[PDB]
Amino acid sequence: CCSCSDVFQYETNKVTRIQSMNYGTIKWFFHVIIFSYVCFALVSDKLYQRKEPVISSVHTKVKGIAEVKEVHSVFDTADYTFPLQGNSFFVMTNFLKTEGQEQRLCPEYPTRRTLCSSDRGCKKGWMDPQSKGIQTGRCVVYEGNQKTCEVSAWCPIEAVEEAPRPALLNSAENFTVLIKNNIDFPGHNYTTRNILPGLNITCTFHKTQNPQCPIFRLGDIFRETGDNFSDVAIQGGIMGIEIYWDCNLDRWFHHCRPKYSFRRLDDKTTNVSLYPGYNFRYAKYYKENNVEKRTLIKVFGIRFDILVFGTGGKFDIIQLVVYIGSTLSYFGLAAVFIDFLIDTYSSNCCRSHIYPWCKCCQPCVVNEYYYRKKCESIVEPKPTLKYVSFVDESHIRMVNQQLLGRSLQDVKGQEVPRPSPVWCQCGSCLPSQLPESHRCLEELCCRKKPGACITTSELFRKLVLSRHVLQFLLLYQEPLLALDVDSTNSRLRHCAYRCYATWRFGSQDMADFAILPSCCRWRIRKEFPKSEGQYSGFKSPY
Amino acid sequence: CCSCSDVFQYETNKVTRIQSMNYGTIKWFFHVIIFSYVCFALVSDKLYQRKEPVISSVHTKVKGIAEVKEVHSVFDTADYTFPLQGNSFFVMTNFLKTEGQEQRLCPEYPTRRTLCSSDRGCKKGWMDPQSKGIQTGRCVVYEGNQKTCEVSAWCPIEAVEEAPRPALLNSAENFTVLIKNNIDFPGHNYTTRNILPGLNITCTFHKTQNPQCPIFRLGDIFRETGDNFSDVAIQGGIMGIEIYWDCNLDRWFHHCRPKYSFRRLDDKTTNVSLYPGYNFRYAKYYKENNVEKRTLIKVFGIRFDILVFGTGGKFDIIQLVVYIGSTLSYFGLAAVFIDFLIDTYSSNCCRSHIYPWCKCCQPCVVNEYYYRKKCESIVEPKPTLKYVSFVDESHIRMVNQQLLGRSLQDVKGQEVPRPSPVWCQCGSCLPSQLPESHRCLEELCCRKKPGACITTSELFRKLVLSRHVLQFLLLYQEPLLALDVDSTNSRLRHCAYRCYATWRFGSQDMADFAILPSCCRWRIRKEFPKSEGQYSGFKSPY
Amino acid sequence: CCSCSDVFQYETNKVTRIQSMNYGTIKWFFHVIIFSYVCFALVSDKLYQRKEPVISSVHTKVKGIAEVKEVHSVFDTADYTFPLQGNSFFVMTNFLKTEGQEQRLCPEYPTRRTLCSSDRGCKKGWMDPQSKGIQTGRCVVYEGNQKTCEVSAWCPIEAVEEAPRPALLNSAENFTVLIKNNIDFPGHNYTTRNILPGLNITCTFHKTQNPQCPIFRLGDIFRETGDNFSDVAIQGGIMGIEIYWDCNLDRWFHHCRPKYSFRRLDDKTTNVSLYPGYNFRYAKYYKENNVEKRTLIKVFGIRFDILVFGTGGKFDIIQLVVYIGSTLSYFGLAAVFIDFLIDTYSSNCCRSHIYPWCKCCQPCVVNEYYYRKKCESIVEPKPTLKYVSFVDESHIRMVNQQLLGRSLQDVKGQEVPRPSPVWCQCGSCLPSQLPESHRCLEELCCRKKPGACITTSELFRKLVLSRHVLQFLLLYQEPLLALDVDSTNSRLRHCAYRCYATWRFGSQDMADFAILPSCCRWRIRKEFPKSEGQYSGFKSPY
Ligand SMILES: Nc1ncnc2c1ncn2[C@@H]1O[C@H](COP(=O)(O)OP(=O)(O)OP(=O)(O)O)[C@@H](O)[C@H]1O
Ligand SMILES: Nc1ncnc2c1ncn2[C@@H]1O[C@H](COP(=O)(O)OP(=O)(O)OP(=O)(O)O)[C@@H](O)[C@H]1O
Ligand SMILES: Nc1ncnc2c1ncn2[C@@H]1O[C@H](COP(=O)(O)OP(=O)(O)OP(=O)(O)O)[C@@H](O)[C@H]1O
Ligand SMILES: Nc1nc2c(ncn2[C@@H]2O[C@H](COP(=O)(O)OP(=O)(O)O)[C@@H](O)[C@H]2O)c(=O)[nH]1
Ligand SMILES: Nc1nc2c(ncn2[C@@H]2O[C@H](COP(=O)(O)OP(=O)(O)O)[C@@H](O)[C@H]2O)c(=O)[nH]1
Ligand SMILES: Nc1nc2c(ncn2[C@@H]2O[C@H](COP(=O)(O)OP(=O)(O)O)[C@@H](O)[C@H]2O)c(=O)[nH]1
Ligand SMILES: *[C@@H]1O[C@H](CO)[C@@H](O)[C@H](O)[C@H]1NC(C)=O
Ligand SMILES: *[C@@H]1O[C@H](CO)[C@@H](O)[C@H](O)[C@H]1NC(C)=O
Ligand SMILES: *[C@@H]1O[C@H](CO)[C@@H](O)[C@H](O)[C@H]1NC(C)=O
Ligand SMILES: *[C@@H]1O[C@H](CO)[C@@H](O)[C@H](O)[C@H]1NC(C)=O
Ligand SMILES: *[C@@H]1O[C@H](CO)[C@@H](O)[C@H](O)[C@H]1NC(C)=O
Ligand SMILES: *[C@@H]1O[C@H](CO)[C@@H](O)[C@H](O)[C@H]1NC(C)=O
Ligand SMILES: *[C@@H]1O[C@H](CO)[C@@H](O)[C@H](O)[C@H]1NC(C)=O
Ligand SMILES: *[C@@H]1O[C@H](CO)[C@@H](O)[C@H](O)[C@H]1NC(C)=O
Ligand SMILES: *[C@@H]1O[C@H](CO)[C@@H](O)[C@H](O)[C@H]1NC(C)=O
Ligand SMILES: *[C@@H]1O[C@H](CO)[C@@H](O)[C@H](O)[C@H]1NC(C)=O
Ligand SMILES: *[C@@H]1O[C@H](CO)[C@@H](O)[C@H](O)[C@H]1NC(C)=O
Ligand SMILES: *[C@@H]1O[C@H](CO)[C@@H](O)[C@H](O)[C@H]1NC(C)=O
Ligand SMILES: [Zn+2]
Ligand SMILES: [Zn+2]
Ligand SMILES: [Zn+2]
Ligand SMILES: [Zn+2]
Ligand SMILES: [Zn+2]
Ligand SMILES: [Zn+2]
């Protein structure tokens, strides 16, 4: 069935170009706003570029010294900064040291959960998360008359003490951090650093004056987020330095520079905050007197997490070509909307109810014309599909229901606008010669109500029964037909059926399923007799 | 060529509305399942919301003490936890310390790769990854009769010793970790913490009883993943605490709370595992006797990586509007499928082979009707395009092939259903007056097989040759044509060609490329003579 | 208005199948390249699989020892590696130690910013980021005649000293790192490790010979990126070990193995580099003589960041089904292009200018035929819409403009190809009986230029005025119409208007808005008189 002809064939939809100005306004508005929006998305979001995330690597150095008044001591970088290499770094701003701790037995600190009245109160080997040593069955005196359960631990047990305010290293707001950041785009093959040639180191980052100096003062970091460093220093906190690398690697429009933002990554430290701060414990272990002692320090400080994010984009053909396709179909949505306004405003319900009431959508009656000139109604050509027309009526009843042993005259069907026997009402219908219930189909009168027949009209005589016009139509199809055979009379009879069907039913597909009235059918059979045998019924082409 | 009329014009496709119930079933099923699926994707995946990832910041504190039996010592937080600030934290559960190491020369430990028979076996300066000191040319006795190559290193060299089982700090399953987690959505501007007001600290996380208490017991973490802490503690491992923040920031339906999950990020520790555990080495450096010594500790423990992931979504108009478009086109796929079932079930191969065999798809013959009423066949109007019809046949041969100096009577063409000279077979065809090979086109007889001609039929006389009907048709187009000029006879002749072409070829576009038989053409020319000059050939409109 | 019939109805577009070979070539080329491309995207990018990122966990151990010549000492793993657990690890390759530092007062190192001429130069309590101690008002002699401001700090203050070249631990290129990496796909439930059973540990990673051995020599890592380890070791650097896990978890085609790549994450160390290296400071605190001293070490080394990335994919039905839809519409773009080539090449401007000049796109004239057989022009049926035809002309003027009190004869309209009073030019037009300005519409002559009328032609007499043909047409619609009533004469008159409108205007929708000439209208009214009252005007159906 296939051929080079079937291969080389193009399908294009039949369209009807409506000249409606209103529809033109709507269509152009939709297309313009979709184009204006999608063109923006392309320019603003750089959807024409292939984009790659940064591969960052941060190195931080804190400079500054603090005079701690605990005797006065001096704290350098090696004293307050802890070995956090990478994105985050820590700056201790407060501490509580319990020095000289040695592994031995000692009375517990008088916490409310450690007081005893006798040795019966304290258990042996008992441990709980708030306990700083394994309890012993004895309850020793701590000091004076205070009796606390004795434990084996690093002694003296560190006191339950509030964080010392003001912060011992509240000078930490004067410390500066240099942040060296290298980004790499491997797919785009572009490496760069936030430190540029000719960079003064005496600078300090300022949001406007010096936005590209990577030496940030900690106090300025805190005052750029509306935080109080003095309050945060006492108990600690978490702060965050965002570095945003928005880079386009096009040589025409090239810019790949960092943008520094600051954001507290912790709950605000208020007077009634719930479990605030950032503290941990670490110990310095030293051997003296041939015994190992430790200095236990509870460190409260600010942890600065450095969050380097960004993207580097370079122009790519493939990305633009896909985005194009996506934006190209959006324009089509305009048609769907208007096609709906055509289908909805074509319904008879619009004219029945809404038009007489609103009276504002009255000139929207042309949608019936548009729908008539756009959509065509076609019914499944099932065998049960039939059509019946009566003279007294102006509409054709589609008989879609298979006859339940009832005369087709009585059978009711769906109305369609046009493009003697008991059932007979004209007086000229003859009884059906068809057997079984097949006769039901042929039991059809020319009109529903009693009155004059249709075959009595001279139009039926000189149009359907006229041998001249039928013979002329036969010659038209076959210019050399043999007219002396009884098959000529049979073809004459077939044409009379098809002309009554087309004369009465305007459409050809509607006349394909025509069933003629008994009066007209038998008048035709008399005018064009077959004596070979029984006449055949209506037979559906499908 | 452009006009405000061209600007304001709408294109809508012509459609034919099929009333097929089967096609309606298929279309509605497709639309319903696409709508039901896409509505789900919207509700389930929250595709109507703009979603942002969390910006987390974890702070962990481990509480608990262990009685290590190595002499009995006590290990606090500062003793087993190592300075890992951030997501991960480490809890030492085993160790091997080689204390008192001093920088000097010593015999190597008797590893199989360090035994010597004499000083010739050991090289000077030799180093390999399993060597713990630079070898010296001498081979000193370690102990008794064991001779091992002498090295310069921290001495005594740490023994190659198995991890001490049971774990020295197997009490570490009783330790609790508080995890403080703050998430931030900057675009949505929403900050929150996993610790809520009114949080008892005596709680411990339970999967059902207390799911929101952020104090996790390590043994419970391990038993919630079916791990044996006692086996993992001996050699170490890696564990992972996932915190899932699924948040929707809509005030109507607001919930942003963590969900804690546990997952071992390490290979299961079996009896025959390959290189299991998690250990490292670190040294404590102390100066005594004015010389620097170090305690080298091989630490085996569990590293808990805290993996905070999630998304916070808030309702956005733009996201819903794009998703709508995507889901809106899926419905259209229903038409493609049915349109195919129409195009496929219309082919003659369906009736030729499949219908007589299967006999089940017999009522699917209406697809031929649907295809006839939907698709129209149109052929390229190239100059070579021609049409030839013979009386004895019922189909028209499209002559698409340019004539290779052969009479058009002999030329064969593709069949199309209808909507004396050697080549002559009727006896009335006259020789072509056309010159060169142009005559070939005009060398065409009314019929393929010998027999009666077509011009002898009275229909050709009173339809094509009839001056009355031709003159009437001319008056129809021009109601005031001058009938006394020879141009009237020329227009009469042109109409006779066009009527024979339309009488014989039903379609107008098929009659545009008609080539009349020589007999009919010359009969027309005789009935409507031109004596001014030679008659013109068939000339294609394109 | 709704019915089970409206529910079960299918919309299919009317298409015209063009047999153009050129259009077939273009359509098949577009479809083939779209299919060939989208099939590739599916195979290459594995778009048919659901893909999940890895959940990695890296553990690193460095082996190797260095002979440092500072007296000769030996550095083990515990000496050069710093407590960096996780992805990154650090290997010290150089240092500068200032040992024996004690908290006291000392002269500042003679930096250019610390020299004084007297105690007036140095301030008390002054601090700046390059200062290593709080200044005191006194200016003490450092050595000889060098006078430097005295400070309180850890003394002696560390000298401003260049990094010692060659690197003290330049043997660090001989160190090996074992990297243990476990990936987990939770959604796909697949866990694996880069260390396989039967793995020799004597191996060292080689790009080709031994690509899966996870023991990397640092010198080889540097020589695989074209770096000089000896130069990098002196001042430090940042290096990166990428581990790529491209896994497909389909049992048929299963492969999940790592791929090791190396990339320097730092600026190249040249002779004139800007702020190169990677160094920090840390202190060892020891108590001797009952006083606390510290050894301050400036460590220069290489930080190796381990970047584990990858994806594991498994076949998913839903992902393939969505991708299908996206690729399925791309094919449709072929039609849009050709439909445009049809619409563009149909314009008259193509034939007017481009065709006579280029002469190469001459056979592209068939696009006019395609457009004629594809697109149909329809005009809004507004009440103001009118049509006027004159005998002397061959085109119909659409009068879309509402008449401004001017005779319709004078009014000009847009030309459309066909499918006595002052305004009168025929001499037979009668004055309008219509009142107000409504007469303007009826003031229309049969022709624009003076000459013979149209009603004098016998065709108008025997077609429009002929009572026989009009009566026959009336009988056709109603085979039993009463012909003896004056309503028969009124229907005769209505049919004469509609036939003149259809005889003159070919289209039915164009004849719906016809306005007849005054001569023909009044001739019809005389031939079919109404004496009941005034005759009505042209009234628009909409
Ligand atoms: N926190 C800081 N505040 C101000 N300047 C700084 C800071 N950290 C480093 N610098 C300066 O930046 C320059 C380059 O820094 P870098 O640390 O790489 O070199 P450096 O010689 O090792 O620095 P230094 O020895 O002073 O710690 C140096 O001149 C250093 O003085
Ligand atoms: N691992 C843990 N197990 C149980 N409770 C804990 C743990 N870590 C902290 N807590 C309790 O949680 C509360 C808040 O913790 P947070 O550390 O911020 O305050 P804190 O006073 O510094 O804690 P602490 O001094 O007891 O270490 C404290 O009351 C503390 O006792
Ligand atoms: N950097 C390295 N170079 C070479 N081999 C190594 C390195 N690190 C570990 N190995 C070897 O890999 C094997 C498994 O490593 P793993 O550390 O898990 O076991 P281990 O017994 O604790 O190793 P070790 O005690 O030798 O440090 C061991 O046999 C070890 O010798
Ligand atoms: N449209 C239509 N066709 C009919 C009707 N009755 C019969 N036919 C057609 O006419 C044919 C039978 O005609 P018939 O009277 O038997 O004459 P014969 O076929 O020459 O013997 C069948 O093929 C039918 O398709 C009718 O009521 N309406
Ligand atoms: N359809 C069709 N048209 C023809 C044929 N032969 C000639 N014509 C048309 O008739 C015209 C030539 O007619 P001709 O005999 O020369 O009469 P003349 O044009 O008045 O001199 C040309 O324009 C052709 O388009 C034919 O076989 N078929
Ligand atoms: N197409 C067209 N229709 C017309 C014209 N003039 C009148 N009509 C129609 O003819 C009808 C009026 O005819 P009229 O002379 O009053 O006869 P009557 O309706 O029987 O009284 C109206 O319904 C109009 O639609 C015209 O110029 N062109
Ligand atoms: C920070 O420095 C300024 C000037 O150097 C000084 O006035 C201020 O007191 C310092 N802050 C603290 C907390 O010491
Ligand atoms: C990246 O760019 C450098 C400089 O042009 C070039 O030497 C190198 O080969 C490039 N790498 C790739 C992967 O193309
Ligand atoms: C850096 O800036 C400071 C600002 O006071 C200036 O004094 C100094 O000279 C600058 N250094 C250089 C190298 O420009
Ligand atoms: C900052 O904190 C300090 C000490 O807590 C307090 O004295 C001061 O008033 C605070 N400043 C502001 C602006 O709240
Ligand atoms: C953990 O604690 C429970 C009760 O506090 C105790 O019975 C158990 O022995 C402890 N586990 C270890 C390993 O010490
Ligand atoms: C975030 O919310 C707070 C509280 O309403 C408001 O003060 C702040 O300005 C907001 N930030 C932004 C970026 O809108
Ligand atoms: C916390 O829970 C424990 C459970 O035993 C209870 O004893 C204790 O009183 C609770 N504390 C508070 C503050 O509710
Ligand atoms: C857990 O490990 C210990 C020591 O390795 C062993 O005695 C015990 O049976 C193990 N428990 C289970 C459930 O395997
Ligand atoms: C690295 O080892 C090789 C052979 O073991 C040796 O020749 C070379 O000198 C070593 N490199 C350094 C910097 O010591
Ligand atoms: C993952 O696979 C293992 C082995 O088949 C199975 O025991 C376990 O239940 C699976 N987990 C899930 C979430 O299906
Ligand atoms: C590992 O490879 C080395 C290569 O020299 C070889 O000598 C050694 O025997 C191998 N070990 C094993 C267990 O195969
Ligand atoms: C590597 O560095 C060393 C010392 O800086 C130098 O002697 C040697 O020439 C360098 N090698 C190369 C290939 O540049
Ligand atoms: Zn009857
Ligand atoms: Zn009847
Ligand atoms: Zn012939
Ligand atoms: Zn012939
Ligand atoms: Zn006139
Ligand atoms: Zn006139």
Numbering used by the authors:
A (entry chain C), B (entry chain A), C (entry chain B): 4 to 73, 84 to 432, 473 to 595
The paper states:
The P2X7 receptor is an ATP-gated ion channel that activates inflammatory pathways involved in diseases such as cancer, atherosclerosis, and neurodegeneration. When present in high concentrations, such as in pathological inflammatory states, extracellular ATP acts as a danger signal to cells by binding to and activating the P2X7 receptor (P2X7R). This spatiotemporal signaling stimulates the innate immune system by triggering assembly of the NLRP3 inflammasome and subsequent cytokine release, as well as activation of various less understood signaling cascades, ultimately resulting in apoptosis. P2X7R antagonists bind to either classical or extended allosteric ligand-binding sites that exist within the extracellular domain at the interface of two protomers.
To gain molecular insight into the binding of ATP to hP2X7Rs, we determined the cryo-EM structure of the full-length wild-type hP2X7R in the ATP-bound open state at 3.0 Å resolution. The minimum pore radius of the hP2X7R in the ATP-bound open state is 2.5 Å, the same as the rP2X7R in the ATP-bound open state, and large enough to pass partially hydrated sodium ions such as those present in the closed pores of human, mouse, and rat P2X7Rs. Although there are structural similarities within the extracellular domains, the pore and cytoplasmic domains of the hP2X7R in the ATP-bound open state are rotated in comparison to the rP2X7R in the ATP-bound open state. Relative to the rP2X7R, TM1 of the hP2X7R is rotated up in-plane by ~7° and TM2 is rotated up in-plane by ~6° with the hinges at the extracellular ends of TM1 and TM2, respectively. The rotation of TM2 is further propagated into a global rotation of the cytoplasmic ballast by ~10° in the hP2X7R relative to the rP2X7R. This twist in the pore and cytoplasmic domain, much like the tightening of a spring, decreases the overall height of the hP2X7R by ~4 Å compared to the rP2X7R (distance between Cα carbons of residues 514 and 521), likely representing an inherent flexibility of the transmembrane and cytoplasmic domains in the ATP-bound open state conformation. In the ATP-bound open state of the hP2X7R, ATP is coordinated by the seven residues that are conserved in the orthosteric pocket of all P2XR subtypes: K64, K66, T189, K193, N292, R294, and K311. In addition, the hP2X7R-specific residues, L191, I214, and Y288, form hydrophobic interactions with the ribose group and the side chain of Q143 interacts with the 2′-hydroxy on the ribose group (3.3 Å). Of these subtype-specific residues, I214 and Y288 in hP2X7Rs are not conserved across P2X7R orthologs. No cryo-EM density for CHS was present in the structures of the mP2X7R and the rP2X7R in the apo closed state or the hP2X7R in the ATP-bound open state.
